Design a binder for this molecule. Structure first.
Ligand SMILES: [Fe+3]
Length: 159
């Protein structure tokens, strides 16, 4: 079991209400801290209105919602692939430089994203020497520092 956390650089000042039109980094299409929890959360405080109905387009309603994302694994929406590092043909594959926990966070570190949707051990695991350079978006419209994820997380995820 992990916690889903939303990780941001210190010195940006956007809160959870303020996410529309930001850029984002996800581990990949369909993963738990990655597409599932933040996108469903955003859908249920009504930030992402489900744009589709020729077609349940979740990918569309999300592309409508952030400016540009990296979401390795994305099928339909070429906005979702727009911040991804790598080659033309490769960069948005389900494994690619920006795929996964480590890659979602490297997206944000690299400046390629304003937020990374990840898990509670990602910043320590990947950059223990730069943890104070980050904080976490809480659901209550505050920030807390990276250690505070028990008190600052989008959800607790099963095994
Ligand atoms: Fe996961």
């Amino acid at each position: 079991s992990y916690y889903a956390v939303a990780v941001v650089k210190k010195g940006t000042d956007f809160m959870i209400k303020d996410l529309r039109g930001k850029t984002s980094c996800h581990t990949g299409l369909g993963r738990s801290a990655g597409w599932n929890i933040p996108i469903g959360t955003l859908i249920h405080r009504e930030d992402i209105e489900w744009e589709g109905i020729e077609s349940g387009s979740v990918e569309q309603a999300v592309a409508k919602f952030f400016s540009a994302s990296c979401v390795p694994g994305a099928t339909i929406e070429q906005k979702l692939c727009r911040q991804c590092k790598g080659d033309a043909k490769t960069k948005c594959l389900r494994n690619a430089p920006y795929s996964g926990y480590s890659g979602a966070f490297q997206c944000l570190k690299d400046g390629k994203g304003d937020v990374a949707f990840v898990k509670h051990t990602t910043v320590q695991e990947n950059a223990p020497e730069e943890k104070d350079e980050y904080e976490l978006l809480c659901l209550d419209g505050s920030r807390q520092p990276v250690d505070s994820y028990k008190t600052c997380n989008w959800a607790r995820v099963a095994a």
